[PDB]
Amino acid sequence: ATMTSMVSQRQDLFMTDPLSPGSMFFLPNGAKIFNKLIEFMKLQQKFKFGFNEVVTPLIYKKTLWEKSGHWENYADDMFKVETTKEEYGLKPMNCPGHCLIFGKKDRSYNELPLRFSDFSPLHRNEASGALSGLTRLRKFHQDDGHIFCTPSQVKSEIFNSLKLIDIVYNKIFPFVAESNYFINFSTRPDHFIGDLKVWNHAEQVLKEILEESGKPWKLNPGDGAFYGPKLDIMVTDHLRKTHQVATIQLDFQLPERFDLKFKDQDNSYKRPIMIHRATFGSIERFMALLIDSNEGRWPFWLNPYQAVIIPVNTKNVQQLDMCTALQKKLRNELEADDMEPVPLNDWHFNVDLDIRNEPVGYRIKSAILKNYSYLIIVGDEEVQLQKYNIRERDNRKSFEKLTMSQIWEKFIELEKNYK
């Protein structure tokens, strides 16, 4: 039994049905987690690193995949469909579409760097025994992106693109001069395409980046790719298992095969440099890694169960009213029979309430096994003192006596700073 499957069983995160083999179901909780990760990524891309989200078509004509050469390339690794017969097929990747977007209009050097980002679902057909859990899948969401820029600025872009990664694995996340990840730098093979000039410019720029990075990097000379240099992000498990999550890969083949052009400052037509960018890699896979790392214990913001309120006596009126009040505040929800709707950027916390008639210790225990980030209990003392008893799960000495307000502000100041 995998850790993933186990945590899913416990928290009701995921589902799998034979009617849809290899395709992942997301329950309301897995929903919350997924959507939250995606939201974080979106904010970071749009409001910091300058990416513009687009939504591309899921399926394309055979002729398109033939233009990119990914038709014969992906044979049984890609699904297919027939139309009323042109023989359409489903996109394993976002690349060709994002090339079309660039090609549809006349581009100028002043629009560059032009960066696109797409969260659209991706379907890949793999052997019935090849796919296991979230790591190897059929239908999987990936956060993609592409940078179209003049060579001069390439370095800068790479830098920024790495910074994002640095913020993800080395800052916002646990599990390991001393950093979380190292980098595999993949140089030119013996057989390649595209002029060697821009090739060496690229490679040199990269050598400079990694050199001044401070992060450790393996040279891995000569492996991949005929369309140009790669960078693989490597993070190691607490179990010592080494994982490649995201990859930054320059592509010289698509610009030439899709014939993309941009007006330069010298008023001549030059072909733009394309950069494949990923961070979370496979979102499902990323969630996998997170699961294996935290074994089901989520940071306060990502946690499907943010906190729980337990009254000492189920039949105690004071405690009941107090708890219900705090809940109603923390969840921040509006009645359905009402009219006025919910606004934007208003805070909402899950905050379940246990009304079960069992003993206090029982709800404590069960709620602990349930992973809740914060346990808030109300006894006689809590009632008389008009406060709440709150604790973090991962420490188990906190026990702060806090007012509704103070709690609200604490959770807000939590999701604001993440962690």
352 CB neighbour count, 10 Å cutoff: 16
Q: Is 95 a catalytic residue?
A: yes
Among Zn ion, a second copy, none, the one that 337 touches (CB under a kind-dependent 5 to 8 A) is a second copy
Please choose, from the candidates 137, 142, 231, 133, the residue with its C-alpha nearest in 3D space to the C-alpha of residue 182: 231
Check 11, 32, 95, 115 and give the catalytic one: 95
The token duo for 319 is: 């405690």
The token duo for 26 is: 């997301």
Among Zn ion, a second copy, none, the one that 317 touches (CB under a kind-dependent 5 to 8 A) is none
Q: Is 142 a catalytic residue?
A: yes
Per-residue CA distances from 390 to 345, 366, 377, 402, 419 (Å):
26, 16, 7, 7, 17
CB 254 within 8 Å of CB 271 = no
Q: Which helix (H) or strand (E) holds 117?
A: strand 114-117
Nearest distance in Å: CB 361, a second copy = 23
Q: Is 98 a catalytic residue?
A: no
CB 154 within 8 Å of CB 273 = yes
Answer for which of 10, 73, 127, 242 binds a second copy (CB under 8 A) is: 127
Please choose, from the candidates 124, 147, 195, 140, the residue with its C-alpha nearest in 3D space to the C-alpha of residue 50: 147
Contact flag: residue 85 with a second copy (CB under 8 A): no
Answer for which of 125, 150, 179, 253 binds a second copy (CB under 8 A) is: 125
Q: For a second copy, which is the closer residue by CB, 167 or 176? A: 167
Check 146, 277, 363, 393 and give the catalytic one: 146
Q: Which helix (H) or strand (E) holds 400?
A: strand 400-402
Beta strand 114-117 with 52-53 is parallel
Please choose, from the candidates 155, 168, 149, 128, the residue with its C-alpha nearest in 3D space to the C-alpha of residue 37: 168
DSSP 357: S
Answer for which of 6, 10, 52, 222 binds a second copy (CB under 8 A) is: 52
Answer for which of 67, 124, 141, 276 binds Zn ion (CB under 5 A) is: 276
Nearest distance in Å: CB 128, a second copy = 7
Distance, in Å, from the CA atom of 225 to the CA atom of 203, rounded to the nearest integer, reads: 13
Q: For a second copy, which is the closer residue by CB, 215 or 387? A: 215
Q: For a second copy, which is the closer residue by CB, 81 or 317? A: 81
Contact flag: residue 177 with a second copy (CB under 8 A): no
Which window, 60-68, 211-219, 389-397, 401-409, contacts a second copy (CB under 8 A)? Answer: 60-68
Q: Is 276 a catalytic residue?
A: yes
Answer for which of 7, 78, 95, 407 binds Zn ion (CB under 5 A) is: 95
Distance of CA 289 to the CA centre of its chain: 11
Q: For a second copy, which is the closer residue by CB, 60 or 181? A: 60
Check 115, 123, 188, 276 and give the catalytic one: 276
Beta bridge partner(s), residue 234: 182, 244
DSSP 170: I
Among Zn ion, a second copy, none, the one that 100 touches (CB under a kind-dependent 5 to 8 A) is a second copy
Check 142, 249, 306, 327 and give the catalytic one: 142
Which window, 89-97, 197-205, 324-332, 353-361, contacts Zn ion (CB under 5 A)? Answer: 89-97
CA triple 268-271-272, angle to 5 deg: 115
Answer for which of 7, 90, 308, 309 binds a second copy (CB under 8 A) is: 90
CA triple 192-195-201, angle to 5 deg: 100
Contact flag: residue 71 with a second copy (CB under 8 A): no
Angle, to 10 degrees, between the axis of helix 28-44 and the axis of helix 283-294?
A: 110
Restricting to residues 334-373, which ones interact with a second copy according to CB under 8 A?
A: 334-339, 341-348
Q: Is 348 a catalytic residue?
A: no
Distance of CA 351 to the CA centre of its chain: 24
State the virtual CA torsion across 214, 216, 222, 226 in degrees, nearest 10. -60
Q: What string marks each residue from 312 to 331 as x (binds a second copy by CB under 8 A) or -?
A: -------------------x
Distance, in Å, from the CA atom of 411 to the CA atom of 306, rounded to the nearest integer, reads: 9
Angle, to 10 degrees, between the axis of helix 317-331 and the axis of helix 404-417?
A: 30
Which window, 162-170, 195-203, 229-237, 369-377, contacts a second copy (CB under 8 A)? Answer: 162-170
Among Zn ion, a second copy, none, the one that 276 touches (CB under a kind-dependent 5 to 8 A) is Zn ion
Nearest distance in Å: CB 358, a second copy = 16
Restricting to residues 255-294, which ones interact with a second copy according to CB under 8 A?
A: none
Which residues sit at the interface with Zn ion, rule CB under 5 A? 95, 276
Q: Catalogue the active-site residues.
A: 95, 124, 142, 144, 146, 230, 276
